[PDB]
Amino acid sequence: EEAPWPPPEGAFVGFVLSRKEPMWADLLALAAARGGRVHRAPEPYKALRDLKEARGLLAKDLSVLALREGLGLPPGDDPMLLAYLLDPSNTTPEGVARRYGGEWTEEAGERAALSERLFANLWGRLEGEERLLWLYREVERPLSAVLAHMEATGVRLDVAYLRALSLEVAEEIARLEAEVFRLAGHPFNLNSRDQLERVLFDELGLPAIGKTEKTGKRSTSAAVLEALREAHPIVEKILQYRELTKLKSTYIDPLPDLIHPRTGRLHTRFNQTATATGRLSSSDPNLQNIPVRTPLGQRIRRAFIAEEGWLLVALDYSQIELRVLAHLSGDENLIRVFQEGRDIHTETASWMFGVPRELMRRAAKTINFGVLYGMSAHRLSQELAIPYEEAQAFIERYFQSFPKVRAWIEKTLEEGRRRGYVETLFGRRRYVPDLEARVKSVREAAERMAFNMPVQGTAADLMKLAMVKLFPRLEEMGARMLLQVHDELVLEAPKERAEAVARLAKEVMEGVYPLAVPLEVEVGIGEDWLSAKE
DNA sequence: GACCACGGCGCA
DNA sequence: ATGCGCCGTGGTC
Numbered sequence: 001e002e003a004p005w006p007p008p009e010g011a012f013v014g015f016v017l018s019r020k021e022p023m024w025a026d027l028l029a030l031a032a033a034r035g036g037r038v039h040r041a042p043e044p045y046k047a048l049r050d051l052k053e054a055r056g057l058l059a060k061d062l063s064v065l066a067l068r069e070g071l072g073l074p075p076g077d078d079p080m081l082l083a084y085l086l087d088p089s090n091t092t093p094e095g096v097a098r099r100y101g102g103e104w105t106e107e108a109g110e111r112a113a114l115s116e117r118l119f120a121n122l123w124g125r126l127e128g129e130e131r132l133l134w135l136y137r138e139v140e141r142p143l144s145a146v147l148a149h150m151e152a153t154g155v156r157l158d159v160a161y162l163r164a165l166s167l168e169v170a171e172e173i174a175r176l177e178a179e180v181f182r183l184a185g186h187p188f189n190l191n192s193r194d195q196l197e198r199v200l201f202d203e204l205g206l207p208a209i210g211k212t213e214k215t216g217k218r219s220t221s222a223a224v225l226e227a228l229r230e231a232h233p234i235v236e237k238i239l240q241y242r243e244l245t246k247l248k249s250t251y252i253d254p255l256p257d258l259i260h261p262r263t264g265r266l267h268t269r270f271n272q273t274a275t276a277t278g279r280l281s282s283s284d285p286n287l288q289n290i291p292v293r294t295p296l297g298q299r300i301r302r303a304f305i306a307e308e309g310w311l312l313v314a315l316d317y318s319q320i321e322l323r324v325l326a327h328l329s330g331d332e333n334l335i336r337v338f339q340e341g342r343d344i345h346t347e348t349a350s351w352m353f354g355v356p357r358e359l360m361r362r363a364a365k366t367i368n369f370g371v372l373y374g375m376s377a378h379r380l381s382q383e384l385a386i387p388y389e390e391a392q393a394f395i396e397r398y399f400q401s402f403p404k405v406r407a408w409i410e411k412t413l414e415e416g417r418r419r420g421y422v423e424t425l426f427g428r429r430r431y432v433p434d435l436e437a438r439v440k441s442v443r444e445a446a447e448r449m450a451f452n453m454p455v456q457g458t459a460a461d462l463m464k465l466a467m468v469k470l471f472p473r474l475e476e477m478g479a480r481m482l483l484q485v486h487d488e489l490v491l492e493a494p495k496e497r498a499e500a501v502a503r504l505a506k507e508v509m510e511g512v513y514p515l516a517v518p519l520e521v522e523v524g525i526g527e528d529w530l531s532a533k534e
Numbered sequence: 535g536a537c538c539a540c541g542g543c544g545c546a
Numbered sequence: 547a548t549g550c551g552c553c554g555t556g557g558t559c
């Protein structure tokens with residue numbers, strides 16, 4: 001079925017890259033398949049100009065590359081998106097191909113023919129599934145195009161700043177290390193958890209708290225060291241060393257080396273079919289886990305800056321998962337809190353009775369989260385420095401204040417056992433087979449994954465939809481969408497329009513989809529990521 | 535050179 | 547006793 005290039009319109013494209021990252025890859029081959037007929041392009045780059053849309057497996061990748069080359073080529077249909085909506089465990093072409101009667105190879109033609117077959121088989125599986133079809137048409141397909149532009153745009157990084165920070169951090173690392181060696185009486189590789197384990201529990205007299213999952217080594221995790229804070233002066237220094245070496249090795253050092261030559265900016269990949277809940281993920285580099293919670297983290301956030309003459313706009317959905325929970329469960333007390341414009345964490349702790357709003361909120365905050373994950377009392381203790389007794393109680397009072405949440409959890413599990421899957425507000429599905437496992441530990445783990453999904457997944461849907469609606473508006477205002485961090489959006493705007501952009505973006509996000517409770521958005525504007533988050 | 539399992543930890 | 551992706555160590559091929 002070999003015909004000369006070019007191919008008819010609407011043909012499924014197949015491409016081969018020298019590496020997985022579209023912004024860094026050489027385009028090795030380009031082929032298209034239509035009516036079982038395969039066309040292979042003599043010169044991939046030149047041939048790119050003939051396409052008016054990228055339709056096929058991993059379409060966003062080819063689109064990102066086209067944008068890199070100055071071509072306005074939009075991603076279209078992608079069988080990966082259909083498969084992922086059918087079952088979120090469909091995360092790769094290799095896995096998908098197998099499951100649905102194909103073979104993911106390394107040739108552009110075969111890949112183009114794989115795309116065709118796969119789209120047929122998957123689309124047919126989606127007839128009658130009108131809610132998934134809605135997700136595909138109204139969210140995932142348009143979203144892929146938005147993500148393609150975010151990836152091609154990238155974000156500006158202050159390299160000189162990071163270079164200087166690295167040298168300072170290094171100095172502090174050496175001092176902590178030297179001190180650790182002093183307390184240990186001898187040098188050793190502090191980055192080796194095995195060597196550290198012997199030092200702490202064999203050479204020093206320190207008690208071993210917990211063991212590691214796979215190999216049963218005496219754990220040296222932060223949880224363990226924290227609980228060992230005042231059993232010996234050395235552990236305190238090890239925690240500081242760990243924080244500093246984590247951020248230096250993971251962010252401070254690698255990021256400056258990843259700046260693209262043409263753009264002078266940092267380009268991440270927004271993976272659209274990689275999670276079980278419907279969230280995006282970010283990789284190569286991951287810009288969804290840039291530090292922020294510690295002073296040194298905040299200093300790292302400062303490295304992310306606006307282009308000169310522009311500003312960063314950062315928008316954050318307040319407590320979106322709790323709000324989704326209020327809607328899903330219908331809990332009146334919970335809904336009331338939000339509709340009255342109250343702050344749940346300050347309200348939730350108010351039910352340490354006798355205080356409308358005086359007491360630490362980070363406890364009520366720790367609790368609310370613990371509810372989302374199925375956290376047990378024993379965990380609240382370590383995560384609150386509170387005796388096991390006062391933890392188990394804190395949890396019971398919660399389900400008294402918010403009864404319908406428990407009812408919703410129970411109902412979600414029961415339905416999940418029935419149908420074999422649970423679903424988001426919009427109908428996104430996750431299959432959770434182990435709900436009927438006969439080992440309690442396995443069964444209950446499955447239950448936590450099961451009831452968390454509708455909460456995490458609805459919040460993901462709301463944000464995705466918000467991005468879809470917001471993107472066209474930004475273009476008209478001459479603004480850029482840069483990053484998404486699950487419940488946050490980071491935009492780039494010309495200094496003069498930043499304020500106007502902030503108003504608009506905020507409103508679009510808050511109105512994305514009216515629920516039983518309002519969606520509130522914190523918005524900030526600044527020269528860098530740190531100052532943009534108020 | 536590439537890849538692996540593990541423990542560990544950054545963010546939502 | 548939620549969801550990700552990346553790091554160094556210790557290791558194979």
Ligand SMILES: Nc1ncnc2c1ncn2[C@H]1CC[C@@H](COP(=O)(O)OP(=O)(O)OP(=O)(O)O)O1
Nearest residue numbers: 317318319320321322343345365369372487546
């Ligand atoms: N330590 C932690 N453990 C688990 N999940 C966490 C977490 N920190 C954040 N998350 C996830 C779970 C939900 C989300 C919470 O985001 P915020 O941290 O900003 O807390 P918010 O609800 O906004 O309270 P406010 O900011 O008003 O004090 O991030």
Ligand SMILES: [Mg+2]
Nearest residue numbers: 316317318319
């Ligand atoms: Mg917040």
Ligand code: NA
Nearest residue numbers: 087089431432
């Ligand atoms: Na499955």
Ligand code: NA
Nearest residue numbers: 022061269270
């Ligand atoms: Na990509």
Ligand code: NA
Nearest residue numbers: 091274275276
């Ligand atoms: Na997955």
Ligand code: NA
Nearest residue numbers: 283284285552
């Ligand atoms: Na990688």
